């Protein structure tokens, strides 16, 4: 009866170190709609994060976009941490600029 979230972490524009961008965490395919989504910078929770209005797909599963302004560097690590009833523990997905 429950559906686990799909997660993609990516940037709005092609990432170039030192240039301002947006970090996106797109959660989709999940049911029920309650979900916990955090964006991480080197393991820490980024404070100011916005999200889209709750909607759902033709198959009734929900999707949300979480996003924040960021400036990628060579050393900094970014990830998205997702918690859902279907998850025994929160799921971390690292940002890979090639995906």
């Amino acid at each position: 009866i429950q559906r686990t979230p799909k997660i993609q972490v990516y940037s709005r524009h092609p990432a170039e170190n030192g240039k301002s961008n947006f970090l996106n965490c797109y959660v989709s395919g999940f049911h029920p709609s309650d979900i916990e989504v955090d964006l991480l910078k080197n393991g820490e929770r980024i404070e100011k994060v916005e999200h889209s209005d709750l909607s759902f797909s033709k198959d009734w599963s929900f999707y949300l976009l979480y996003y924040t302004e960021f400036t990628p560097t060579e050393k900094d690590e970014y990830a998205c941490r997702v918690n859902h009833v279907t998850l025994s523990q929160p799921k971390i997905v690292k940002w890979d600029r090639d995906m």
Binding site: I1, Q2, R3, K6, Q8, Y10, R12, H13, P14, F22, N24, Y26, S28, G29, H31, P32, S33, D34, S52, D53, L54, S55, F56, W60, S61, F62, L65, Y67, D98, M99
Partner: protein, 276 residues
């Protein structure tokens, strides 16, 4: 091209944490343009696209009143559905509804939609003839008989054939600089070695609108459907979408592979190759 308008209602119960939350969002094609949230400090239907902002106060009052009334009636509907399934008062449940109209390039109705789901499972749907319903089970049959006695199908047909297409046509004109502008994908192929023997070719489509797109890999002109990794089309946050398709190729054989891109914004379809 063709166009659609859709509204999405979600009602969520949460026993012990207040009354059920009611959310409504409206879309034209892949552009959200209104939202309502019963959990907001002052619940109102609110704009989410610049071209709807010009609607006057009587528009926003009407949509807010409907949505406030819907907050109450969808809470009653959740109570009803709980009883139809002999469910306890302690669990959380979801009722979802989506409805709207599709029109072709002449603005004429192609078809109307109204369907509902309970806890993610199809519950009742208005049939394509806009005159009857398909009920998924004996609980939905109760709803069906209620709606038949209230002459609901005739109300839906009148909305879907009338005001739905009229409002959609107005939105398409007021927002024609974006709603009727197809932005083609910016495309490229990247190469990611896996080992000495294999590498990934990833074909990218970026910045396109609307979200509909076709991305395929051929090897010697034969589609690689079973061997292509396709990610879900994803929003960039600036109204546009992104997608990629990837195939694992034997090292040295990269030139047998071509990426093919179809999108409404493209004068002609695109064939792409790894540049080296």
């Amino acid at each position: 091209g063709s166009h659609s308008m859709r509204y999405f209602y979600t009602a969520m119960s949460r026993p012990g944490r207040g009354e059920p939350r009611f959310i409504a969002v409206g879309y034209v094609d892949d552009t959200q343009f209104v939202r309502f949230d019963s959990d907001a400090a002052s619940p109102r239907m609110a704009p989410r696209a610049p071209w709807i902002e010009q609607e006057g106060p009587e528009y926003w009052d009407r949509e807010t009143q409907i949505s406030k009334t819907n907050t109450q009636t969808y809470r009653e509907s959740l109570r009803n559905l709980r009883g139809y399934y002999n469910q306890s008062e302690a669990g959380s449940h979801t009722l979802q509804r989506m409805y709207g109209c599709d029109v072709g390039p002449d603005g004429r109705l192609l078809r109307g939609h109204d369907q509902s789901a309970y806890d993610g499972k199809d519950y009742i749907a208005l049939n394509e003839d806009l005159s009857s319903w398909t009920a998924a089970d004996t609980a939905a049959q109760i709803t069906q008989r209620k709606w038949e006695a209230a002459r609901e199908a005739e109300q839906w047909r009148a909305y879907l054939e009338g005001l739905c297409v009229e409002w959609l046509r107005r939105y398409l004109e007021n927002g024609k600089e974006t709603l009727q502008r197809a932005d083609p994908p910016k495309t490229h192929v990247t190469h990611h070695p896996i080992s000495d023997h294999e590498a990934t070719l990833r074909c990218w489509a970026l910045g396109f609108y609307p979200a509909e797109i076709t991305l395929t890999w051929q090897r010697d002109g034969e589609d690689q459907t079973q061997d292509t990794e396709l990610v879900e089309t994803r929003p960039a946050g600036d109204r546009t979408f992104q997608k990629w398709a990837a195939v694992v190729v034997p090292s040295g054989e990269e030139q047998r592979y071509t990426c093919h891109v179809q999108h409404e914004g493209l004068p002609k379809p695109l064939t792409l190759r790894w540049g080296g």
